[PDB]
């Protein structure tokens, strides 16, 4: 067995959702969950079939995003992993409810717009995702000014009243 | 600390759901969640108590399946992990909702019928599940003909109209 | 890349919930989810901002609980990880529903009162949580007397009728 | 405006789920939710399109059940109401989660195997479901022997341990 | 058929949750859901069995509250209705998630601390809950000072930051 | 007591969600749930406070939509009812998950883009919503050609593959 670190290649600030699913119906169900959750949502979805034909499956509403999802899943090469790439202006908070609720979804490793690397283990014709390096290590702790800043930020973004 | 690879023993046609929980009530709650979700469901369930007597706990509607869940948990030897072995014809899409919603369940590592191996870390009398190798690596990417084939499959199975 | 084992410090009787989220709104949303779930709940919450100023963000009801959450999270030093430390008498089964449903929450690594150690991977200015050592390995399998004990236990605690 | 009482007819041992939804996608979504929840489930589903051509829509896995669902819905004649008739051995507790979570479902009026009558208000070419007469009025309050009886029943059925 | 207006008897300091369920397991499941949601919760639960012996079923952690729940159900006399009376300091927001998710629960008519009256329709030995008069009619529309106050109130109570 | 029929004012290109909630936190919680669910969502929200100041509370991202929601609630005058008016292009299927999950939300009466009327009961200074006339009665049942039509429609719309 060997460990590897695989960076996810994507434009800066682009949001992705990396998870684990099962059953071929994962593709149609997640595509449907996403378009039902947000009108006009632009995304790309890829799912790594882990048996039978063992083909990476894809679906989406934006070819640029579908390409990113597929190419990255080919690099990861992990059975049953899925990757959703969201277009600009679309966020994981808008759709995580639908991903979590999908009957084929088992778990979600990460949802983020930060640079990310995936820790994987490999043995024979199998690979496992061990974790995700999401963004960077902390540089300190917020002071009163920073506490006021994040509270105020959410109000200006329209997320808090 | 040492890293180990533990294969999960199970008949190829059976599905297993491996996860993390806490509190002894995990056993009765999951058993109840399963029988409430699917009528006549056959399964075996085991939970690894991580303190006190530190005993593997089990419950089920099929003795052979219960034994299989317990045997695998003894090999995994990870505190607070649980394993459900579903009988033939019962699938994770039928019950993941109930497992996800169980108050004691923290997360699910895998739900699958594919060959499964678990990466674990060990230190002293403690073990951690780091990830799972679920099925195999991708052999390629589907083309439109294959997309048509998987759509056809779901309609023939009655999952899509 | 290097693997490390990080122990969690806290009184024996306190429960902690360790997970992965994203977006700064994680703090207010989780704080609100907790106080909405249980009246008079006491806790400390910390979230590791993984971009920008990269500051650990915190919120809570008692200074001692907040210190525990922040102190441990700083030791873990993993982007987008969050840690909730529950005060005496408040349990994960009481609030996991609200944590799982939080739109910023991606997954939960562990919920426990047992001694806990976290397996992490580090590369440059990034770290990833690979897994958790929750409590200890199993010493055996429950027999009939122990099955009876755990069933009776739940009735005496008032969790089962 | 006038009030009417509409009986819902079905085989004594079968369960019906009567609710309110919207959007034509209600039919395929509920059919899929049902077959995904329970393997081999037999049911009949009907939905009353409230605008456009105003046609009762239907789908299912059993002709007799689909016919029953449509006939009952035609008698109800209420825009956006849906009715599911479950085959023998399939219960609302097995599928309510999926009906509740369906994006088109607004609410559920009843889920029962009891004699059922629906109170409706009518005005012009519009009708509203005001409530349901589900079974009969109480004849008294259980004493402890009856408590013991209902507890024993659930243990005999395998719903409680 | 006749319409009746039935006032709910409840101390001004208590909250109630009135809903519709089915199957005898409603009693143990809802009691379990409440005690799992909030530690030390005080409540009374009653459920109107609508077939068989047709007995009001009861369970709870406070005898006075259980009796009040039963008294109200005897007055309402509606098949399959359930009533939870919450003790002082325990609120519906703390437990509605568990009530909504209970597999036997079909819907919830009301959750409130306000004076409540139930509109019912009666025909033979059957009754239907048509709606609830929850509190009083509006006296106007909030101005900016009132918006500011309702926001400040939630911050002083600790529900918002 | 008297029954009344109250029409809901709603331009044809808009959708509404009418429901029942409780507690003043309903306003901020629902507004937050909506903006977290869909980016840039345009809506108006009104809530009929049924205690204390008894004011129709208002919040939203579009002044005209907010005013429409408020106007309708002044006409309905039912304690604890809430109304969300969605701007053109935003649909109930996009947000019902968030409304259902809101801790203050008890139930949803209707979600629709069709003409709506509300049946209400009035006694003293209280009113109860008894039901909703959502759209119209059925004109018939779909035949095979119409089934084919509704299936085709969803594929053209991109909701089904």
CSV table of C-alpha atoms in Angstrom, one decimal, chain E:
chain,number,residue,atom,x,y,z
E,1,UNK,CA,-72.3,16.4,9.9
E,2,UNK,CA,-71.9,19.1,12.5
E,3,UNK,CA,-69.1,21.6,13.2
E,4,UNK,CA,-67.9,22.2,16.8
E,5,UNK,CA,-65.3,24.5,18.4
E,6,UNK,CA,-63.2,22.9,21.1
E,7,UNK,CA,-61.0,25.0,23.4
E,8,UNK,CA,-57.7,23.3,24.5
E,9,UNK,CA,-57.2,23.4,28.2
E,10,UNK,CA,-53.7,24.4,29.1
E,11,UNK,CA,-51.9,26.7,31.6
E,12,UNK,CA,-50.9,30.0,30.0
E,13,UNK,CA,-47.2,29.1,30.8
E,14,UNK,CA,-47.2,25.8,28.8
E,15,UNK,CA,-46.7,24.9,25.1
E,16,UNK,CA,-48.5,22.3,23.2
E,17,UNK,CA,-48.0,20.4,20.0
E,18,UNK,CA,-51.1,19.0,18.3
E,19,UNK,CA,-50.8,16.7,15.3
E,20,UNK,CA,-52.0,13.6,13.3
E,21,UNK,CA,-50.3,10.2,13.4
E,22,UNK,CA,-51.1,6.5,12.9
E,23,UNK,CA,-50.1,3.1,14.2
E,24,UNK,CA,-49.8,2.2,17.9
E,25,UNK,CA,-46.0,2.6,17.8
E,26,UNK,CA,-46.7,6.4,17.7
E,27,UNK,CA,-46.6,6.4,21.6
E,28,UNK,CA,-43.2,4.8,22.2
E,29,UNK,CA,-41.6,6.5,19.2
E,30,UNK,CA,-42.7,10.0,20.1
E,31,UNK,CA,-41.8,9.6,23.8
E,32,UNK,CA,-38.4,8.3,22.7
E,33,UNK,CA,-38.0,11.2,20.3
E,34,UNK,CA,-38.7,13.8,23.0
E,35,UNK,CA,-36.3,12.4,25.6
E,36,UNK,CA,-33.6,11.9,23.0
E,37,UNK,CA,-34.0,15.5,21.9
E,38,UNK,CA,-33.8,17.2,25.2
E,39,UNK,CA,-32.2,15.9,28.5
E,40,UNK,CA,-34.6,15.9,31.4
E,41,UNK,CA,-37.5,17.1,29.3
E,42,UNK,CA,-40.9,17.2,31.1
E,43,UNK,CA,-43.9,16.4,29.0
E,44,UNK,CA,-47.2,14.5,28.6
E,45,UNK,CA,-48.2,12.7,25.5
E,46,UNK,CA,-51.6,11.3,24.4
E,47,UNK,CA,-52.6,9.5,21.2
E,48,UNK,CA,-56.1,8.7,20.1
E,49,UNK,CA,-56.2,5.0,18.9
E,50,UNK,CA,-58.9,5.0,16.1
E,51,UNK,CA,-59.6,1.4,15.7
E,52,UNK,CA,-59.6,-1.8,17.8
E,53,UNK,CA,-60.2,-0.9,21.4
E,54,UNK,CA,-60.2,2.8,20.4
E,55,UNK,CA,-58.3,3.9,23.6
E,56,UNK,CA,-56.6,7.2,24.3
E,57,UNK,CA,-53.0,6.0,24.8
E,58,UNK,CA,-50.6,7.9,27.1
E,59,UNK,CA,-47.0,8.2,28.0
E,60,UNK,CA,-44.8,10.9,29.5
E,61,UNK,CA,-42.3,12.1,32.1
E,62,UNK,CA,-44.7,14.2,34.2
E,63,UNK,CA,-48.0,12.7,35.4
E,64,UNK,CA,-49.9,16.0,35.6
E,65,UNK,CA,-48.9,16.8,32.0
E,66,UNK,CA,-49.9,13.3,30.8
E,67,UNK,CA,-53.3,13.7,32.4
E,68,UNK,CA,-53.8,17.1,30.8
E,69,UNK,CA,-52.9,15.6,27.4
E,70,UNK,CA,-55.4,12.8,27.9
E,71,UNK,CA,-58.2,15.1,29.1
E,72,UNK,CA,-57.8,17.2,26.0
E,73,UNK,CA,-57.9,14.2,23.7
E,74,UNK,CA,-61.1,13.0,25.4
E,75,UNK,CA,-62.7,16.3,24.6
E,76,UNK,CA,-61.4,16.5,21.0
E,77,UNK,CA,-62.4,12.9,20.4
E,78,UNK,CA,-60.7,12.7,17.0
E,79,UNK,CA,-59.2,9.5,15.7
E,80,UNK,CA,-55.4,9.4,15.3
E,81,UNK,CA,-54.8,12.9,16.7
E,82,UNK,CA,-51.9,13.2,19.2
E,83,UNK,CA,-51.1,15.9,21.7
E,84,UNK,CA,-47.9,16.7,23.5
E,85,UNK,CA,-48.0,19.1,26.5
E,86,UNK,CA,-44.6,20.6,27.2
E,87,UNK,CA,-43.6,21.5,30.8
E,88,UNK,CA,-42.4,25.0,31.6
E,89,UNK,CA,-39.2,25.9,30.0
E,90,UNK,CA,-39.4,23.3,27.2
E,91,UNK,CA,-40.3,24.7,23.8
E,92,UNK,CA,-41.6,23.4,20.5
E,93,UNK,CA,-38.5,24.6,18.6
E,94,UNK,CA,-36.5,22.2,20.8
E,95,UNK,CA,-38.4,19.2,19.6
E,96,UNK,CA,-40.4,19.8,16.4
E,97,UNK,CA,-37.6,18.3,14.4
E,98,UNK,CA,-38.1,15.0,16.2
E,99,UNK,CA,-41.9,15.1,15.9
E,100,UNK,CA,-41.7,15.9,12.1
E,101,UNK,CA,-39.2,13.1,11.6
E,102,UNK,CA,-41.2,10.4,13.5
E,103,UNK,CA,-42.2,7.8,11.0
E,104,UNK,CA,-45.7,7.6,12.5
E,105,UNK,CA,-46.4,11.3,12.4
E,106,UNK,CA,-48.4,12.5,9.4
E,107,UNK,CA,-48.6,16.2,10.1
E,108,UNK,CA,-48.7,18.8,12.9
E,109,UNK,CA,-51.7,21.1,13.2
E,110,UNK,CA,-50.2,23.5,15.7
E,111,UNK,CA,-47.3,24.2,18.1
E,112,UNK,CA,-47.9,27.1,20.4
E,113,UNK,CA,-48.1,28.7,23.8
E,114,UNK,CA,-51.1,30.9,22.8
E,115,UNK,CA,-54.8,30.2,23.7
E,116,UNK,CA,-55.9,27.5,21.3
E,117,UNK,CA,-59.3,26.3,20.0
E,118,UNK,CA,-59.8,23.5,17.5
E,119,UNK,CA,-62.4,23.5,14.8
E,120,UNK,CA,-63.8,19.9,14.4
E,121,UNK,CA,-66.4,18.3,12.1
E,122,UNK,CA,-68.4,15.3,13.5
E,123,UNK,CA,-70.4,12.6,11.7
E,124,UNK,CA,-71.5,9.5,13.5
E,125,UNK,CA,-68.7,8.1,15.6
E,126,UNK,CA,-66.0,10.0,13.6
E,127,UNK,CA,-64.5,13.4,14.0
E,128,UNK,CA,-62.0,15.4,11.9
E,129,UNK,CA,-59.8,18.3,13.0
E,130,UNK,CA,-60.5,21.1,10.4
E,131,UNK,CA,-58.1,23.7,11.8
E,132,UNK,CA,-56.8,25.6,14.8
E,133,UNK,CA,-57.5,29.1,16.1
E,134,UNK,CA,-54.0,29.8,17.4
E,135,UNK,CA,-53.8,33.1,19.2
E,136,UNK,CA,-55.3,36.3,17.9
E,137,UNK,CA,-55.8,38.3,14.8
E,138,UNK,CA,-53.2,41.0,13.8
E,139,UNK,CA,-53.5,44.6,15.0
E,140,UNK,CA,-51.3,46.2,12.4
E,141,UNK,CA,-47.9,46.0,10.6
E,142,UNK,CA,-44.6,46.5,12.3
E,143,UNK,CA,-42.7,49.7,11.8
E,144,UNK,CA,-38.9,50.1,11.9
E,145,UNK,CA,-38.8,50.6,15.7
E,146,UNK,CA,-40.7,47.3,16.1
E,147,UNK,CA,-38.4,45.5,13.7
E,148,UNK,CA,-35.4,46.7,15.7
E,149,UNK,CA,-37.0,45.6,18.9
E,150,UNK,CA,-37.8,42.0,17.7
E,151,UNK,CA,-34.2,41.7,16.6
E,152,UNK,CA,-32.8,43.1,19.9
E,153,UNK,CA,-35.1,40.7,21.8
E,154,UNK,CA,-33.7,37.6,20.1
E,155,UNK,CA,-30.1,38.8,20.8
E,156,UNK,CA,-30.9,39.4,24.5
E,157,UNK,CA,-32.5,36.0,24.7
E,158,UNK,CA,-29.4,34.5,23.1
E,159,UNK,CA,-31.2,33.0,20.0
E,160,UNK,CA,-29.3,35.4,17.6
E,161,UNK,CA,-25.8,36.9,17.7
